[PDB]
Amino acid sequence: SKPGPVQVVLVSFELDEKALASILLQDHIRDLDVVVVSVAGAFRKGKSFILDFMLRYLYSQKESSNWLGDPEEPLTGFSWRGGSDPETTGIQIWSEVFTVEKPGGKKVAVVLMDTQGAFDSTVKDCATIFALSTMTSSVQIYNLSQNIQEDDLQQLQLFTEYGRLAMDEIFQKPFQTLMFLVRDWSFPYEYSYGLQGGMAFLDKRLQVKEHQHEEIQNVRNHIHSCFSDVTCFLLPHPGLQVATSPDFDGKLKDIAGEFKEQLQALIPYVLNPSKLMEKEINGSKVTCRGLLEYFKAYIKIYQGEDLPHPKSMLQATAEANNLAAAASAKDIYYNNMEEVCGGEKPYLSPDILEEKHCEFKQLALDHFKKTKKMGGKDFSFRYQQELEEEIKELYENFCKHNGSKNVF
Numbered sequence: 001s002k003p004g005p006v007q008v009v010l011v012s013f014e015l016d017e018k019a020l021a022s023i024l025l026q027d028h029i030r031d032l033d034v035v036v037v038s039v040a041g042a043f044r045k046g047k048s049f050i051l052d053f054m055l056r057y058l059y060s061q062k063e064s065s066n067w068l069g070d071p072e073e074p075l076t077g078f079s080w081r082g083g084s085d086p087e088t089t090g091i092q093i094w095s096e097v098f099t100v101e102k103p104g105g106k107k108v109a110v111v112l113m114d115t116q117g118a119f120d121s122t123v124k125d126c127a128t129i130f131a132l133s134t135m136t137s138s139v140q141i142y143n144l145s146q147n148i149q150e151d152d153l154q155q156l157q158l159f160t161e162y163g164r165l166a167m168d169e170i171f172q173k174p175f176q177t178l179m180f181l182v183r184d185w186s187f188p189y190e191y192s193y194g195l196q197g198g199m200a201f202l203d204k205r206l207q208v209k210e211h212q213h214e215e216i217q218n219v220r221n222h223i224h225s226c227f228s229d230v231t232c233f234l235l236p237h238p239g240l241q242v243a244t245s246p247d248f249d250g251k252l253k254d255i256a257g258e259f260k261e262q263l264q265a266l267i268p269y270v271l272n273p274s275k276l277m278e279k280e281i282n283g284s285k286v287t288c289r290g291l292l293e294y295f296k297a298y299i300k301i302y303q304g305e306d307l308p309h310p311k312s313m314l315q316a317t318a319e320a321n322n323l324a325a326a327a328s329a330k331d332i333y334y335n336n337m338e339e340v341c342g343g344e345k346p347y348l349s350p351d352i353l354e355e356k357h358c359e360f361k362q363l364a365l366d367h368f369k370k371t372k373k374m375g376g377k378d379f380s381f382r383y384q385q386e387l388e389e390e391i392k393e394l395y396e397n398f399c400k401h402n403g404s405k406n407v408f
């Protein structure tokens with residue numbers, strides 16, 4: 001009953017769909033728009049240290065004020081690396097999804113994602129892990145040591161023709177925020193720690209120059225077709241005790257002061273309620289229920305020998321987008337009907353049951369049609385017709401359950 005990391009993508013690659021569904025289709029979050037914060041990068045680069053502070057912020061927020069902690073008390077990690085073979089490639093998420101009220105009262109679900117791979121441009125693939133993580137997250141925090149290297153940028157080539165395809169055919173950038181998190185920044189006299197120094201440094205690194213390799217200048221020329229926002233944050237060194245310790249357990253006061261300072265800017269910048277950014281695809285928000293569909297559609301196309309064609313990535317996106325609309329409509333029909341004739345609630349005469357059915361079927365189909373969907377009308381119809389068959393089967397079970405409560 002204790003929260004912990006859940007392996008959702010593992011070694012080709014497999015989606016553990018049951019484990020992911022058990023988190024995302026919980027009753028209290030499945031209908032909420034979901035915020036998906038991913039930290040991605042090479043093994044042993046401090047990703048889980050940052051994930052731990054994000055959890056401290058989220059748990060402090062859940063139960064309140066000094067999120068950083070008590071300076072006298074030792075730190076304890078949250079066990080993102082507790083399993084066998086911690087250097088393994090894959091994607092984990094935290095088992096506790098948080099519910100946060102944004103200003104004005106809208107409640108959203110907040111998922112934390114741990115994306116680990118070799119991250120080195122050669123022989124094998126973890127590009128699959130970076131792609132799946134990027135396409136499903138709303139903030140991809142790309143965790144790098146000391147600088148943004150040309151190798152680092154070359155790994156974004158995965159998305160370049162995808163971004164160019166989507167702009168050309170759907171008139172929209174496919175992804176939201178990419179943030180370069182530069183660890184152990186050592187030149188504050190050139191670019192100061194934090195966000196303003198980071199954006200000046202990123203601007204310089206993103207400039208195309210004739211000596212760079214062709215593929216890297218490509219990435220520079222099209223990264224802004226992929227992400228609606230590209231940002232960078234320079235974080236200081238945490239101090240030698242953190243750097244040289246396996247499983248750091250020293251007191252908060254033993255962490256370097258400038259690191260703590262910049263942590264208090266970085267973590268709220270990502271997780272403060274006014275900053276939470278719901279996942280969006282095709283310009284419409286994704287719920288925990290819908291997010292499951294994107295994982296299921298994306299795992300399929302990354303099964304092959306080679307990386308998928310961009311047309312197949314757009315195709316999988318369109319299919320999952322319509323399935324997400326259908327699933328949301330199906331839940332509306334089911335929840336309303338179960339409220340009215342489910343359980344041991346009293347028998348309803350066929351006239352009353354039919355009327356309720358007609359009311360909630362129309363509600364459900366209207367919701368599907370009103371929802372913004374990719375593919376055009378003929379593409380979306382096949383999903384609508386599928387939804388109508390599901391509703392018909394649901395209605396039959398509701399009718400047979402209702403009839404079992406009849407007297408004689």
Ligand SMILES: Nc1nc2c(ncn2[C@@H]2O[C@H](COP(=O)(O)OP(=O)(O)O)[C@@H](O)[C@H]2O)c(=O)[nH]1
Nearest residue numbers: 043044045046047048049238242243245246248
């Ligand atoms: N130099 C440095 N070391 C860090 C930082 N954050 C964590 N560490 C240490 O680096 C090692 C690997 O950290 P870990 O968070 O497990 O890396 P992960 O594999 O990316 O999750 C551990 O000894 C950490 O205590 C940092 O910002 N800078």
